[PDB]
Amino acid sequence: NEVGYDDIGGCRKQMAQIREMVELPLRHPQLFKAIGIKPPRGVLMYGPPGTGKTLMARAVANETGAFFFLINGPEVMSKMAGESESNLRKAFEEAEKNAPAIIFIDEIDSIAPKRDKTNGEVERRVVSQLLTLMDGMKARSNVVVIAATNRPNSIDPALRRFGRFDREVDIGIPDATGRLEVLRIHTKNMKLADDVDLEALAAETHGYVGADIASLCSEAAMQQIREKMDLLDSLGVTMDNFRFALGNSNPSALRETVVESVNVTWDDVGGLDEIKEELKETVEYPVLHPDQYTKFGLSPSKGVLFYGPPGTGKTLLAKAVATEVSANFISVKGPELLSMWYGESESNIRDIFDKARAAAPTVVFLDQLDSIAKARGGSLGDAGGASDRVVNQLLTEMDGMNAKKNVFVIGATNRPDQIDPAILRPGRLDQLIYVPLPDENARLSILNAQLRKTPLEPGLELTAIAKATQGFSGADLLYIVQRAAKYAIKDSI
Amino acid sequence: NEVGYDDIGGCRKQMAQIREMVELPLRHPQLFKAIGIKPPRGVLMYGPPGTGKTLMARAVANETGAFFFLINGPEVMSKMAGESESNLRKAFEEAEKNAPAIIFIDEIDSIAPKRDKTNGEVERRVVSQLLTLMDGMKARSNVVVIAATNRPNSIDPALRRFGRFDREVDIGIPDATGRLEVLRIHTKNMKLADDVDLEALAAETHGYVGADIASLCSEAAMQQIREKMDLIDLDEDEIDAEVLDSLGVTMDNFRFALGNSNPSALRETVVESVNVTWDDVGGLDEIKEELKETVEYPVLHPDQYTKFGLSPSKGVLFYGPPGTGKTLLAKAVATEVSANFISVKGPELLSMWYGESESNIRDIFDKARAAAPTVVFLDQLDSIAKARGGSLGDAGGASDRVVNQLLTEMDGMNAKKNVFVIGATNRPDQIDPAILRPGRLDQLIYVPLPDENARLSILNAQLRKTPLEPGLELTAIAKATQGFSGADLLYIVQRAAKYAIKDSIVPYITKEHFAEAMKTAKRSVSDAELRRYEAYSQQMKASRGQF
Amino acid sequence: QIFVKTLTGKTITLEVESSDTIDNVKSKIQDKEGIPPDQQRLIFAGKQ
Ligand SMILES: Nc1ncnc2c1ncn2[C@@H]1O[C@H](COP(=O)(O)OP(=O)(O)OP(=O)(O)O)[C@@H](O)[C@H]1O
Ligand SMILES: Nc1ncnc2c1ncn2[C@@H]1O[C@H](COP(=O)(O)OP(=O)(O)OP(=O)(O)O)[C@@H](O)[C@H]1O
Ligand SMILES: Nc1ncnc2c1ncn2[C@@H]1O[C@H](COP(=O)(O)OP(=O)(O)OP(=O)(O)O)[C@@H](O)[C@H]1O
């Protein structure tokens, strides 16, 4: 009772990276001694949970011919009188006696934390046993060690050495064609009807993962048997069962890192007929023409500071710029602040900076600038070392990041002078784009933009409402139009 | 397999320092009887990871023919407290009867970390057992213990005393000729192609350690396997064993291997030097021979400069108009004496977490002693005044966390350690008087306005990173600004080069990109700020005290 | 007119419960435990 080999879709690029890595040198002792290169004896898999970490390791090891020594994370170290080292020493000794063998250490993050979060004395005893025994496989015993984890930053940094764990394999989220491929291999044994369309389900589900796609098919079948129950004849899953499963359920974004691509098209902010040409040169031209920076030698400005009047400015002036990319948007916001008093102040940002170049393309939005570096970066600063650990990682991660992959940051605030001036250092914020107040030629098209899904009578004049708005921004244009919809439903009442 | 002298490379000057230090107590103990002083017993190697320090310990043991024994780091901590002390006692007893012998221990940071940050029970258990056994042994068996770590001040400071561990040895990164020797040992069995050049790959990887070069060629050889993947598949269990001889790792596979790999040990700044000459900036020749009279005269004649009772000229400063080439001169001050140099800046290195804000200046003091010579340089002295604090009234001072470790040890080092602090501010009216004292900044180097009539020579050495038009227009590009130095001259270059992404799906550089660029000819550095300090350049001798 | 607030964190314990050295058990076997009232234990002789 095990899974096959071709039961994984969407991860085809990382499959071809790992089929030549752990499957080809295992079955072939030649073509490495002849080339004079020893094969790697360690790989590391990481990414978001529910993406296929524990599934791909059992699939790649079954239909190849191997020993497949399984070992779980939390099941070790739960022993008494210090015998977890003997269970680890007998694990690697019994594998090489009947080579070829595969040692898959599952959940390695529950075994090796960092040395500043050490607990007791038996946690140090099992991380130094693993580091010693990993170096003992240099005799070319055809033993490949696969390690799966969830957080690569919480692991101990002494595991990635020359020989222990050299290669790392990152598993990203599938695309629209990737999420469609998993839906084909999940509705194989299910009785389906004819009204379903798997292309529309993959296009609607953007921020879904490899585990959320299994919830979409299993909940629609459970919904259908709640209807068909009276005094097993025909149980074809309909389109309305999948449409109900999209409503009552939700994707993996349970106030975690947000996976969505909510963007609006053009002419949704009023006017912009002289401002739209200023925003097309920062998120489209590094993607459409990357060779113009490599031929010259300039660094592309991946950051644009935004500031403007009240009303608009936060999201609809920034999310309407990236209409052509539509990648995953991982944002920081209000509640994403210093909630834990130890460690989780910039470590929640360390997986945003380092993953922006690993999981490219990924757009990171930055807002609420007066709640992160207001008093700490000033002339008075912080005295005592209590929470002065916020203005350091925002500056030292700027020079350490180059324009190798598709990175993009956007800073927006209501007060541009309330942020530290080192955030506006040269080399990173050389392009300053200012969003101005909408004038009389733009405020009339604002009222035509936020009245989109309305049964609006075109016989009236929306210019006469906007002509009485001089110091009234788009929020007051939203204020004057909300009262017009309050008495409109009252006419039906 | 045993290793010798040819199996390592790059540190051949560094290996010769370890060579004479360990081969004299082993081979010829007659020098101890003649001079009557105890030779050292414990050396300590350190540096970046992946530099083959464990390979060098096996190379010095087999060639000398001594009794070699290895004690690895994490294998001691994998046991409990009882059997780990018994295994440490057994290693020193067998090496005593087998004199001469080398007891090489590895990874002392896992055994001896910094103890005062985590005051614990096991942090003083195995190191106190080692300390009574290392200092306690005395049998004239002339055995040498070798330590290895990745940071010299990460270990407990009681180990670096006299008699136990005195000689510190740094293992630096190899040079261009050094990194060439590393790949030649690994490619002895790799059947490479004829088009692969030996010296071309040395200049490609600038800051790669020997572990990074060895992983670079294996990934390029693995790309040769996936290039021939469609030729013969993996379903045949080595049936067609006749086409494998035509497997040559040609040189563009190394170009693909450089495109996917990344530098691992380059998380810090350069450890050797920077190379940008004074001719790379245009003009400023009135201070070129002036600085030759103050920093390169004492290091070439150490006797005539100090026998007259004159203090060493340790500190100079750069002041004048703000942002006018002194920020451009931040890297071009090290190539004159061609010494070691690491730049320090407020938001760069001293604005980290507590405990590490003074360890960075500790590394430049180990560079004053263990890696001499050194050059210290701090830029933008008006931004650091917010962290130092301003003295007010007649009773004041700079109550700062970092200035106590700075000012005490910068004057205790003599002229033989070759300490050289360099200053560069933007306004002399924004300098804290508590740091300034007679004896630190007595050398006045005034930086004037950077030659706006001759600023065409500044931008001539600035546009050499891009193929440009041969018919350039350099008539009045920088002579009408008079406040735009070489740092802000990039914005004029960014005006004439940001249009490459536009008007696309052809001309790239035209003469209209520089002719029409004079519409934003502004002046950020006005003449009202320059003339305040032009008279100060001839009257600072009467104001060289408090202010 | 300001404040300084900082929290703390702890780690409780781990244990092994290792005991019973072999030299204590070899002395633990060769002893007596007591015999009720009249449960003599005897002597014996022979092989002249
Ligand atoms: N290509 C795929 N990618 C992600 N998930 C998949 C894929 N195909 C099937 N799945 C579903 O996801 C589950 C496998 O997820 P897995 O056990 O790897 O969780 P994980 O978070 O990736 O790793 P871990 O088990 O360590 O949490 C299966 O139960 C399966 O129904
Ligand atoms: N083109 C437009 N011009 C002005 N207002 C608009 C436009 N389109 C929509 N609006 C309305 O104005 C509001 C935009 O306000 P926004 O969310 O930017 O607040 P803000 O205070 O500007 O943001 P921040 O908190 O970053 O300052 C939306 O709620 C929307 O209904
Ligand atoms: N002469 C040399 N100089 C530098 N590197 C070398 C040399 N010869 C070989 N190498 C490469 O450098 C690596 C040596 O690194 P080593 O095994 O010493 O790691 P290390 O971190 O120094 O050891 P430790 O864990 O004791 O600190 C080898 O893998 C080898 O390929």
Swiss-Prot record, chain B:
The entry lists its GO molecular-function terms as: ATP binding; ATP hydrolysis activity; identical protein binding; polyubiquitin modification-dependent protein binding; protein phosphatase regulator activity; ubiquitin binding
Give residues annotated as binding ATP 2: 323-328
Source organism superkingdom: Eukaryota
**Protein activity control:** The first ATP-binding region has low ATPase activity. The second ATP-binding region is responsible for ATPase activity. ATP binding to the first ATP-binding region induces intrinsic activity of the second ATP-binding region. While ATP binding to the first ATP-binding region appears to prevent ATP hydrolysis by the second ATP-binding region, ADP-binding to first region promotes the coordinate and cooperative ATPase cycle of the second ATP-binding region.
Reported impact of residue 161 to A: No effect on growth rate. Restores cell growth
Q: Alphabetically, which GO biological process terms does the record hold?
A: ATP metabolic process; autophagosome maturation; cytoplasm protein quality control by the ubiquitin-proteasome system; DNA replication termination; endoplasmic reticulum membrane fusion; endosome to plasma membrane protein transport; ERAD pathway; macroautophagy
Q: What is the effect of changing residue 107 to A?
A: Moderate reduction in growth rate
The main enzyme category here is hydrolase
**Enzymatic reactions:** ATP + H2O = ADP + phosphate + H(+)
Q: Disulphide bridges in this chain?
A: none
**Effect in UniProt of substituting residue 263 to A/S:** Restores cell growth
Q: Which residues carry this modification: Phosphoserine?
A: 264, 311, 526
Claim: Membrane is one of the keywords in the record: no
Q: Where is the crosslink of kind Glycyl lysine isopeptide (Lys-Gly) (interchain with G-Cter in ubiquitin)?
A: 97, 114, 138, 314, 331, 386, 465
Cellular localisation: Microsome; Endoplasmic reticulum; Cytoplasm
The UniProt record lists the keyword Chaperone:
yes
- Which of this chain's residues are annotated to bind ATP 1? 49-55, 150, 186
Explain what the record says happens when changing residue 107 to Q: Severe loss of catalytic activity and cooperativity between the 2 ATP-binding regions. Lethal. Restores cell growth
Summarize the protein's role. ATP-dependent chaperone which probably uses the energy provided by ATP hydrolysis to generate mechanical force to unfold substrate proteins, disassemble protein complexes, and disaggregate protein aggregates. By recruiting and promoting the degradation of ubiquitinated proteins, plays a role in the ubiquitin fusion degradation (UFD) pathway. Has a role in the endoplasmic reticulum-associated degradation (ERAD) pathway which mediates the cytoplasmic elimination of misfolded proteins exported from the ER.
Of which family is this protein a member?
Belongs to the AAA ATPase family.
Any further remarks? Present with 78400 molecules/cell in log phase SD medium.
Subunit: Component of the heterotrimeric CDC48-NPL4-UFD1 ATPase complex. The CDC48-NPL4-UFD1 ATPase complex interacts with the HRD1 ubiquitin ligase complex composed of the E3 ligase HRD1, its cofactors HRD3, USA1 and DER1, substrate recruiting factor YOS9 and CDC48-binding protein UBX2. Interaction between the complexes is mediated by interaction between CDC48-NPL4-UFD1 complex member CDC48 and HRD1 complex member UBX2. Forms a complex composed of CDC48, NPL4, UFD1, UFD2 and SHP1.
Q: What is this protein called?
A: Cell division control protein 48
Protein source organism: Saccharomyces cerevisiae (strain ATCC 204508 / S288c) (Baker's yeast)
Portion of the full-length sequence here:
209 to 791 of 835
From Swiss-Prot, chain C:
Domain Ubiquitin-like stretches: 1-48
- Subcellular location field: Cytoplasm; Nucleus
Residues spanning the signal sequence: none
Indicate the transmembrane segments per the record.
none
Q: What is the effect of changing residue 28 to R?
A: Deficiency in ubiquitin-protein conjugate formation
Q: What does this protein do?
A: Exists either covalently attached to another protein, or free (unanchored). When covalently bound, it is conjugated to target proteins via an isopeptide bond either as a monomer (monoubiquitin), a polymer linked via different Lys residues of the ubiquitin (polyubiquitin chains) or a linear polymer linked via the initiator Met of the ubiquitin (linear polyubiquitin chains).
Q: What is this protein called?
A: Ubiquitin
Species of origin reads Saccharomyces cerevisiae (strain ATCC 204508 / S288c) (Baker's yeast)
Task: Print the organism lineage.
Answer: Eukaryota, Fungi, Dikarya, Ascomycota, Saccharomycotina
